[PDB]
From Swiss-Prot:
Disease per record: Defects in KAT2B has been found in a patient with isolated coloboma, a defect of the eye characterized by the absence of ocular structures due to abnormal morphogenesis of the optic cup and stalk, and the fusion of the fetal fissure (optic fissure). Isolated colobomas may be associated with an abnormally small eye (microphthalmia) or small cornea.
Organism whose genome encodes this protein: Homo sapiens
Domain notes: (Microbial infection) The bromodomain mediates binding to HIV-1 Tat.
Tissue: Ubiquitously expressed but most abundant in heart and skeletal muscle. Also expressed in the skin, in keratinocytes (at protein level).
The organism's taxonomic lineage, starting at the top: Eukaryota, Metazoa, Chordata, Craniata, Vertebrata
Family listed: Belongs to the acetyltransferase family. GCN5 subfamily.
Positions of the Bromo domain: 1-102
Summary of the function given for this chain in its UniProt record: Functions as a histone acetyltransferase (HAT) to promote transcriptional activation. Has significant histone acetyltransferase activity with core histones (H3 and H4), and also with nucleosome core particles. Has a a strong preference for acetylation of H3 at 'Lys-9' (H3K9ac). Also acetylates non-histone proteins, such as ACLY, MAPRE1/EB1, PLK4, RRP9/U3-55K and TBX5. Inhibits cell-cycle progression and counteracts the mitogenic activity of the adenoviral oncoprotein E1A.
Assembly, per entry: Interacts with SIRT1. Interacts (unsumoylated form) with NR2C1; the interaction promotes transactivation activity. Interacts with EP300, CREBBP and DDX17. Interacts with NCOA1 and NCOA3. Component of a large chromatin remodeling complex, at least composed of MYSM1, KAT2B/PCAF, RBM10 and KIF11/TRIP5. Interacts with NR2C2 (hypophosphorylated and unsumoylated form); the interaction promotes the transactivation activity of NR2C2. Interacts with KLF1; the interaction does not acetylate KLF1 and there is no enhancement of its transactivational activity. Interacts with NFE4. Interacts with MECOM.
Subcellular localization: Nucleus; Cytoplasm, Cytoskeleton, Microtubule organizing center, Centrosome; Cytoplasm
Protein name: Histone acetyltransferase KAT2B
Effect listed in the UniProt record for changing Y35A: Reduced acetyl-lysine binding
Gene from which this protein is expressed: KAT2B
Residues of the full protein shown: 726 to 831 of 832
C-alpha cells in the first residue's frame, strides 16, 4: 500500500534522527518512577512501529495523533529547559518537515 510505504519511510527517518533517542522505547519505571500515574496515554516510536506493522494507521489523522502524543507527553511531564523537552521540539520540526516533503494529506 502506498500509504503504508510513505508512513514507514517517515517513521524510519524520525527514528534515525539524533534527537529521537529519548522516545525510541517506552519510559521505564526505573527511569521515571511514578511516570505512569501522570501520563494516562503513553506512546513511543517502538509502539508506533509495531502499530504500523499491524496495519493500524489507515489514515494520516492517526499517525499524526500518535506521534504528537509522544511530544505532548514529554512537554507535560518535563520542564521546558530539560534535554527531553528540547529534543521534542527539534524532532517535532523535523517531523513536520518530513510530512510536507511527502505531501501526506487526508
Ligand atoms: C527507554 N527509555 C530510555 C531512556 C529515556 C527514556 N525516555 C524519557 N525518560 C525520562 C526521564 C524523565 N523524563 C523522561 C522522558 O520524558 N523520557 C521520554 C526512555
Amino acid at each position: 500500500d502506498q500509504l503504508y510505504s510513505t508512513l514507514k519511510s517517515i517513521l524510519q527517518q524520525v527514528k534515525s534522527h539524533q534527537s529521537a533517542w529519548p522516545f525510541m522505547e517506552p519510559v521505564k519505571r526505573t527511569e521515571a518512577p511514578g511516570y505512569y500515574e501522570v501520563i494516562r496515554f503513553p506512546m513511543d516510536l517502538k509502539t508506533m512501529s509495531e502499530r504500523l506493522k499491524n496495519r493500524y494507521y489507515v489514515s494520516k489523522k492517526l499517525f499524526m495523533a500518535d506521534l504528537q502524543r509522544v511530544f505532548t507527553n514529554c512537554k507535560e511531564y518535563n520542564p521546558p529547559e530539560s534535554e527531553y523537552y528540547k529534543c521534542a521540539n527539534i524532532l517535532e520540526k523535523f517531523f513536520f518537515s518530513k510530512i510536507k516533503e511527502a505531501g501526506l494529506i487526508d
